[PDB]
Design a binder for this molecule. Structure first.
Ligand code: NAP
Ligand code: NAP
Lengths: 336, 314
C-alpha cells in the first residue's frame, strides 16, 4: 500500500504509540506525514475534523488518540465513553467521506469479558460482562471495532482493528505517583541498590533533595529499603507487555500487507502482543536482576490479560523485543 | 419532576413514539413543548445540536429519534452504528452541558444476546453474542444505555434508559401495521372495491412466509407514553441502585405470529383463509423491575389493534 511519498495522518501523535509511529516511519524514509496537536485540532469536534479531512485529504490514517483509563482517573466514567466514541466516530466517518485508502485503529484487552479464559481469542468478544472499573472504556472500544468492521461490510472500506494489552517504551515517566508499573519498579530497585551500597550523595541527586533525614523517610514511606522492596498485593496477577517499536512494526506491517478481504464476517479484529505473560512477582524479579539489587521482595495485602496471537502469527508477523531486553533498554536510558 | 409549565423537548417528534408523547403530554396539560423537524435540525450534526440546546434550554428531554433496522434496510450496517451513536452522543452530552433536569432514552431488545433465556432480565446484557442482522444497531443501543448510566455515576445526572421490543400505535406508520394493511387489502379485494385499492394478498387467502411460531411482545404507544411520563415524575437514578440500571418496559405477555395474524384477521373481518408457507429468536421482556417501581400496562393487544384500525379507516 503506502509508498515513501504517500500522505499519512497519525492522529494523537504526541502519545506513546503516536510518537513511536512518527519516529519509525521517519526512520524508514516516509517523508509526507501530517501531524496536528490537540490545540490545533480537537478530535472531539466534528466540524473541525470534517474540515481537516476535506482540506488535507490524507491517503492513510493511524488512529492512536485516546482518553485512557487507569487507576488515577477511574472516576471519569462518562468521559471515557463520550470522548472515545466521538474521536472514533469523527475520524472513521470522515476517512470514509474523503476516500482514505486504509486505516488502522487500536483496541484494548479491556474489551474482552472479565471472566474469559486466557489466552484471549478474538471470538471471546461479547462472551460475558466487562470489568467494573474499565466498563465504559471497554464498551467504547467494542463500538470502535464494530464501526471499522461495519464500514468494511457495507461500503468496502479497509479499516483494521489491532487489539493490545499493556504498552511501554524505552523513554518513560519515572515521577512517583505518575509512573506506570515498569518504570516505577525500576526506580524503586535502583534506589534500594543505592541504599545497600551507602551512596548517600547519589540518592539525594536522584530524589532532588538536600536533607538525608527527609530522604530516608520518603524512601521508607514508598516501601524502599536496603534489604527489600515492598510490592502491593499477592504478586499473582499476570500481565502481557508490548514494546512501542513492536507496536509500530505490526501497525506498519498491517497497513502494507493485511487487508479486510484476508480476514473473512464477524470478529475480524486482530489481537497483537508477544504471546507471553508474567506475574507481578516474576516482573519484580526480572527488574531486581537487571538492576543488580541484592535484597528481597516483600508482599503486603485478579483478572489476567494475555492475548492469543495465533491469528496475527498466521498472517506473518511476530514480535522482536522480549520483556527482559525492553527493561534493559529502559534502565540504560534512565541512567542518562 | 415536571410541572405543566416546564419546557420539554421531544427529539424525533414525528415518529411513532414521538407522536404519542406529544399527544399524551398535551392531553395532561404539558403544553410548553419544543419540536424540530429533521429539516430544521439534523441530530447527527454536533454543531447544530449544540446551538439548539444553547438557544432553547429545555428542562426535560425525551430522546425518540433513531435510524431503525428492519428487513428492508438490513444492508445499512455502518449507518446503523454511526448515525445512532451520533444522535445519542449529541443529545445526551449537550443535555448535560445545558443543565437538563431529566432525560429518558429508549433502548431495544436487540441489545440482548440472541440465545438469552426469555423472559429477558436487565442483567442479561453482555451474556453472549447479538443477532447477526441487528449486530451493529444493538451495539449502538448498548452504548446509549451505558452512556446514560456513566453520566449518572460521574456527574450526578438523572438520565434513564427504558428498553422495549415491538412498538405499535393508534397513529402508527413494521409487523403489526403491515399485517393490518395486508388483511384490509385482502378484504377490499373480496368485496370488489377496486377504487379504494406478491405480498401474499389475494381475495381468498393471506399467505405469510415462515412457520409463524416465532414469538413477539408488543407495547401500544399510549402505554409507552404513560411509562415515559411516570419515569419522569417518579423514578430517579438513586432508586435504581451500580450496573444494569436500564429498565425493561412492556406488557409481560407474548404471542406467536400465528396468534397475532388471527387476531388481526378477526378485527378486520376478512372472510378468507390464513396460510403459512413453511419455506428463530423470541423476544419477551421480564418486566418485574418496572412493576416493582409502580407501573404496569393498561392496553391489551386485541384492544390496541382495534384502536389502530379505527384510526386507519380515517
Ligand atoms: N498501555 C497502553 O498505553 C495501551 C493499552 C491498550 C491499548 N492502547 C491503545 O493504544 C492507543 C495509543 O495509546 P497511547 O498509550 O499511545 O496513548 P497516550 O500516550 O495516552 O496518548 C494519547 C494521545 O491522544 C491525544 N488526544 C486525546 N484526546 C484528543 C483530542 N480530543 N484531540 C486531539 N488529540 C487528542 C493526546 O493529546 P495530548 O498529548 O495533547 O494530551 C495524546 O497525545 C490508544 O487507542 C490506546 O487505547 C494503549
Ligand atoms: N418501533 C419499534 O418497534 C421499536 C422497538 C424497539 C425500540 N424502539 C425505540 O423506540 C424509539 C422510538 O422508535 P419509533 O418507532 O417511534 O421511531 P420512528 O417511528 O422510526 O421515528 C424516528 C424519528 O426519528 C427522526 N430522525 C431520525 N434521524 C434523525 C436525524 N438525523 N435528525 C432528526 N430527526 C431524525 C425521524 O425523522 P423523519 O420522520 O424525518 O425521518 C423520525 O421522525 C427509538 O429509540 C427506537 O429504537 C422502537
Amino acid at each position: 500500500g503506502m509508498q515513501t511519498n504517500s500522505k499519512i495522518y497519525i492522529a494523537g501523535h504526541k502519545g506513546t504509540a503516536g510518537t513511536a509511529l512518527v519516529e519509525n516511519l521517519q526512520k524508514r524514509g516516509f517523508n509526507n506525514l501530517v501531524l496536528k496537536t490537540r490545540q490545533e485540532l480537537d478530535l472531539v469536534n466534528q466540524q473541525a475534523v470534517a474540515k481537516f479531512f476535506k482540506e488535507e485529504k490524507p491517503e492513510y490514517v493511524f488512529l492512536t488518540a485516546v482518553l485512557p483509563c487507569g487507576a488515577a482517573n477511574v472516576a471519569q466514567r462518562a468521559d471515557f465513553i463520550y470522548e472515545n466514541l466521538m474521536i472514533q466516530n469523527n475520524v472513521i466517518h470522515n476517512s470514509f467521506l474523503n476516500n482514505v485508502k486504509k486505516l488502522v485503529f487500536f483496541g484494548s484487552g479491556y474489551m474482552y469479558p472479565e471472566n474469559a479464559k486466557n489466552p484471549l481469542k478474538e471470538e471471546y468478544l461479547f462472551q460475558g460482562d466487562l470489568e467494573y472499573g474499565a466498563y465504559s472504556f471497554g464498551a467504547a472500544k467494542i463500538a470502535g471495532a464494530i464501526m471499522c468492521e461495519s464500514y468494511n461490510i457495507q461500503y468496502g472500506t479497509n479499516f483494521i482493528t489491532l487489539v493490545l494489552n499493556n504498552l511501554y517504551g524505552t523513554k518513560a515517566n519515572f515521577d512517583f505517583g505518575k509512573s506506570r508499573v515498569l518504570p516505577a519498579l525500576l526506580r524503586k530497585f535502583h534506589l534500594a541498590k543505592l541504599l545497600s551500597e551507602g551512596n548517600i550523595t547519589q540518592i539525594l541527586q536522584d530524589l532532588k533533595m538536600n536533607n538525608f533525614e527527609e530522604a530516608k523517610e520518603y524512601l521508607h514511606n514508598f516501601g524502599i529499603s536496603k534489604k527489600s522492596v515492598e510490592i502491593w498485593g499477592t504478586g499473582k496477577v499476570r500481565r502481557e507487555f508490548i514494546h512501542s517499536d513492536d507496536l509500530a512494526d505490526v501497525a506498519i506491517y498491517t497497513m502494507q500487507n493485511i487487508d479486510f478481504k484476508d480476514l473473512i464476517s464477524k470478529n475480524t479484529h486482530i489481537n497483537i502482543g508477544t504471546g507471553i505473560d508474567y506475574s507481578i512477582k516474576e516482573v519484580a524479579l526480572m527488574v531486581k536482576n537487571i538492576v543488580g539489587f541484592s535484597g528481597e521482595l516483600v508482599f503486603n495485602t485478579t483478572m489476567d490479560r494475555l492475548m492469543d496471537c495465533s491469528k496475527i502469527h498466521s498472517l506473518g508477523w511476530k514480535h522482536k523485543i522480549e520483556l527482559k531486553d525492553g527493561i534493559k533498554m529502559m534502565y540504560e536510558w534512565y541512567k542518562t
